[PDB]
Amino acid sequence: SELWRVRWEDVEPSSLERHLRSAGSAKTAYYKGNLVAVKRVNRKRIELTRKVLFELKHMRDVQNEHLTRFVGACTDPPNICILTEYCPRGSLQDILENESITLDWMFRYSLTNDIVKGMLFLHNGAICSHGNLKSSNCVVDGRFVLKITDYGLESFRDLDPEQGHTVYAKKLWTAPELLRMASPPVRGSQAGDVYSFGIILQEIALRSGVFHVEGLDLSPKEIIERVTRGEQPPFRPSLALQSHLEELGLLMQRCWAEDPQERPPFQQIRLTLRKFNRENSSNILDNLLSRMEQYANNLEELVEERTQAYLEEK
C-alpha cells in the first residue's frame, strides 16, 4: 500500500464560487485536510509498475517548504487526478495579472530567490526533473512561500498526441531544444529547467505579458515556428529599459543559449542572485513579515482608492 490512492467513495465534490483568483475584474476542493486541488488525467487505465509505485513514493518523499506536497492521485475506473494541496492567492501569472497590485522589484528579488532555492532541491534528489516549468505553474501561498506544481508525473501527464496547435499556444515556455525534435522526454533536461526559468524570469522581470518583442508581436503558431526554425541572429525579448537592471538581463541572456555548453548552472545563478541582492537581508522570517506587511499596505491603498472613487462617483 502506497497510501497515495484516495478512493472516490469518501472524498466529496466540495466546491464553491469563492475568490478563485482574488483579482479585480481551477477546481479547488477539500478532503479531511485543508483546501485540496485536482489535476485530472485522461488515462482510462494505468498499470503502475513498481517503478510507477516508486515514482509515487518519491513524489511523496520530498517534503519541502517550497513544494506543494501531493497526497493521493486517485485511480478511479471512471476518474483520475492528482490531489495536490491547494494554496489560495492565485498563481504568479495572476500575481501580476492584476495591474492593480503594486509589487516593486524587492518582492521580485525575493520571489526569484525563493524559486531558485526551491529548484535547487527540486532537481538533486527524489525527482530528476519535471520539464513543465512555467510562470503560471507555481502559485504563491498564504505567507508568500512560492511552491512548484504538477511535477514528477512519471505517467500522469497529457502524453497523448493532441491539439498540436494549442501545443504551440502553451509551448512557448520550453527550450528551443524541445521544439528541435519530435519527442522530447517528458522529464525535461536540466538544461530545459534552466532555460524555462529563463522564460519565467523574463515574465517576472518585465511587467508585460509573456515574451513580447519591441514593436513586434507574432502569434503563438508563427513565433513557435520561427523559434524552432532558428535564426543566426537568435530570437528573444529585450531584457528591459531600466538602466540599473542589466545584470538580470545578462543572467537571462546566459540562461537561454543556442547550445547547453554555457547554459549557466543554478549554483552560479544563485551566486549572481546573492551578488545582486546588495546585502538586502540576513534574516529568515523578517523577509516573510516584510512581504506580508507591504502586501497589506497595497491592499489598503487599493480598497481606499477604488471604494472612495466609485462611492463619490455615486
Place this chain on the structure above:
Amino acid sequence: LASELWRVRWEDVEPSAKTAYYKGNLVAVKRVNRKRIELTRKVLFELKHMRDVQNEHLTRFVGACTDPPNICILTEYCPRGSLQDILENESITLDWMFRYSLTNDIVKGMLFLHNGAICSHGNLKSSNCVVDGRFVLKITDYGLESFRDLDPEQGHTVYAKKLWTAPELLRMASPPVRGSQAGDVYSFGIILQEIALRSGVFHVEGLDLSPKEIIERVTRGEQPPFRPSLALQSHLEELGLLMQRCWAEDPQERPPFQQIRLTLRKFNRENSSNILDNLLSRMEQYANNLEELVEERTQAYLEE
C-alpha cells in the same frame, strides 16, 4: 544629565492626527500647553528612563521640544489605526483568536511597564494604545509626569477626555497624574469590555447616558457595582467574570496584572499555538479579511 540624547531641539525636524518626520523617521508629535517649562532633575531622570527602556509590546520615545515657541513629545508613528479607532469602524472583520491575542499583548506590555524605572502608566485610556505594521500591540502616554497638560479649567470639555479614570482617582480630589495600580487594573478592565463588545466606552445595554451623566453615576457611590454589562452569552463567562473581578470599587481585591496573566493564560490554553510564528499568522487572517472586503465592495460598486 549631560548625555543630551533626548532633546533634538527641533532644529529642522521634518514636517509633513498631526504626523511629521525626523531624520527620515516618520514620527508623530503631540504638543503640551505649558509655556513655563525649565530644568528638572526629576524630569531629567524621567527622560533618562524613557530613553533607556524598550520591549517587544511597548513603544518608545524619540524627541522632546524644549523651545519656548513649541513644546511637544515626539514618538515613533505606527501605520495601522488606533485600537479603539480600528475596531470602531465595525467593518474590519475581527474575530475571537485575534481578539484574545490582541488582549494578551497589552497585558504583557503593562506588566513589564509596572515594575520598571517608572511605575504603571495611569492615563491608560483605552483609545491611546495603537498598532504597528506587523500588529505589535503598543502603548503611549509613557510616563512623562511633567509632560502632561495640567489645565483644570476645561470643565465639561474635561468630562469629554476623562471616562476610564478611576473613581477612587476621580472622587473630587486633586488627581495624581501617575495614577494608581488599581487605576491600571480599572483601565484594563474597561478596555477588555471595549474589546468584548466593540461599541465604544461604557456601552449601556438599553440606556442612554451623556458623559456628564456617566461621570455622575460613577460618583453616585451606588451600592450596586454598576458597570457596562458583560455581553450575555455562553461562549465564555470567564472573560466577563475577570472583568467583574477587576471592576469592583474596592481597590484591594482588584487582582494585579500577574494574576491577570494567570487568568488570560488559562483562557489561552485553547490555542497556545506559537510565539512569533503566530505573529505571522495574524496578518494572514487580517489580509484575508481585507481582500474579501475590497473585492466584494469593488464588484458591487462596479455593477453600480
